[PDB]
Write an enzyme that holds these catalytic residues in place. Sequence first.
Site, PDB file in Angstrom:
ATOM      1  N   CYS A  89       0.871  -1.174   0.000  1.00  0.00           N
ATOM      2  CA  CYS A  89       0.000   0.000   0.000  1.00  0.00           C
ATOM      3  C   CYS A  89       0.909   1.225   0.000  1.00  0.00           C
ATOM      4  O   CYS A  89       0.868   2.038  -0.917  1.00  0.00           O
ATOM      5  CB  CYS A  89      -0.881   0.018   1.248  1.00  0.00           C
ATOM      6  N   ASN A 112      -5.685   2.623   1.047  1.00  0.00           N
ATOM      7  CA  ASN A 112      -5.543   2.601   2.499  1.00  0.00           C
ATOM      8  C   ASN A 112      -6.870   2.450   3.239  1.00  0.00           C
ATOM      9  O   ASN A 112      -7.777   3.273   3.076  1.00  0.00           O
ATOM     10  CB  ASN A 112      -4.848   3.887   2.960  1.00  0.00           C
ATOM     11  N   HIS A 146     -10.567   4.834   1.400  1.00  0.00           N
ATOM     12  CA  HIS A 146     -11.823   4.101   1.555  1.00  0.00           C
ATOM     13  C   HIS A 146     -12.239   3.593   2.927  1.00  0.00           C
ATOM     14  O   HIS A 146     -11.448   3.528   3.872  1.00  0.00           O
ATOM     15  CB  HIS A 146     -11.872   2.939   0.580  1.00  0.00           C
TER      16      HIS A 146
END
Lengths: 278, 278
Positions: free
Chosen positions: A160, A182, A221
Amino acid sequence: TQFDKQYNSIIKDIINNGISDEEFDVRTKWDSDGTPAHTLSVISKQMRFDNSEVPILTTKKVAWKTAIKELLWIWQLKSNDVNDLNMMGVHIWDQWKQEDGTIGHAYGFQLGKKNRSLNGEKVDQVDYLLHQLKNNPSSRRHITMLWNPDELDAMALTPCVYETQWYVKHGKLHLEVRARSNDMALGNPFNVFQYNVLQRMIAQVTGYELGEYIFNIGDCHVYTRHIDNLKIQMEREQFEAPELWINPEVKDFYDFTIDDFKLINYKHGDKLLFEVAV
Amino acid sequence: TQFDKQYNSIIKDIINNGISDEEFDVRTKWDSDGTPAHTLSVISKQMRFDNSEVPILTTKKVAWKTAIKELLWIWQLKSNDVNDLNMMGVHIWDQWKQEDGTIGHAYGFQLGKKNRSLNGEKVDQVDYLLHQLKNNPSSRRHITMLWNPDELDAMALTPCVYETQWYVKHGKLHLEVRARSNDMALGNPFNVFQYNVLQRMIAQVTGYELGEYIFNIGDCHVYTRHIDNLKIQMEREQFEAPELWINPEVKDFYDFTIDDFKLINYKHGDKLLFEVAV
């Protein structure tokens, strides 16, 4: 710089102008029922601290002790083998254990590959940086890459937080971090604190005073079912940023150890449960 | 979204809060006297357009016609050889022409590398993207990366605009590009417009309505000698956004030609002279 108010602002921003993906399938599904879990996304979000306070929530407990142990596993030790993390007594990565207990050519591996030249010396990524920061603080080329395009296939997973660019300006050291995606609920709070400590470690070995901490999210999100407990979280009272004691004696980055780190007075809210999805 | 309104802002800021680097040396020096020519940077600057208009300058003439040709050479052609770019009627890159005539394992060469696998096939960074776009618009791994760590030492030079991340949400192709460092005066106007053309191209061959357009820079610098004419650029009158025409008959990404584009009604201000420094 509270990190709570900022963390709050984005969560609250997703619940209002967020975008779902119900009209899409694939990937995620809960463990409680085992079927589809969607999100609410937004693009380009930025969190910048000035290192006044230390990036950490107060509305919930963050596994800070573990963050640092993970950070060290990647950056300091530079390991792709989880069996090494097991020795640190951390079993969070056990799920991605490969045939050889590794995550393949990822993280600790990408930060350890000796592919650069430094005075007729094959050096790795981190090592290089360290030297350039002191011997050449003006460069606009201070960047670390975990997203090696030639090795995405030979990885147990795609990271990520894949990059960072450092900026030396006026005895200061500035760090910018970008994550392709993330999980705001789980990973973000972890990752924010996780990398700040790294900035702090570097700034001590090179002697540059603390600059700005810019953290950027690409696909910010939140998993749908998480919303309810998140709403509770945004109602809990905040606390003061705990002082974070680091062993002053350290002169070399590879001489750091967990016992060399401490969080003074971490007052926080009770507890909250978030279902895990995959 | 005039792009002027925003650009001027970035400039007006680099003037009032801009960090200098006089204290440091190396690299950049003029030609007029050939010695020490440094900047004035600011970190983490981002711009964004809803694509109402086309991002482009009006207070100065942007050689747009050549921006595309450069773009083309890299994405559509995927070549590192300047002779190819020569035949197009461009000599702006002849400077870095290596012993063989290719700028090494940089830019176009990277995009061309057949490093990814898809359906038992070896594909390059570009094609793979095009596939997953329609075959997986929900993905969170739509990333183009020129900055390959394994080959930095094999490149004639390092890219300013090195990475992209496309997001697909509700039939809308969204593009976010990252620039490590950029010269607001000479280079910025060029690169911004250049990539809004790239978006529209990809946005068409797939079939998605135009999304949001994000553009951020790490080292957002400006040269000290330039301040003078820039203080005048901002005083210049602004014009209306010229309509960009793209051949509707095109369906494939590799079926474009320079003639397939045309900038309708590009009224703009006079000329400003900015000296080159390297």
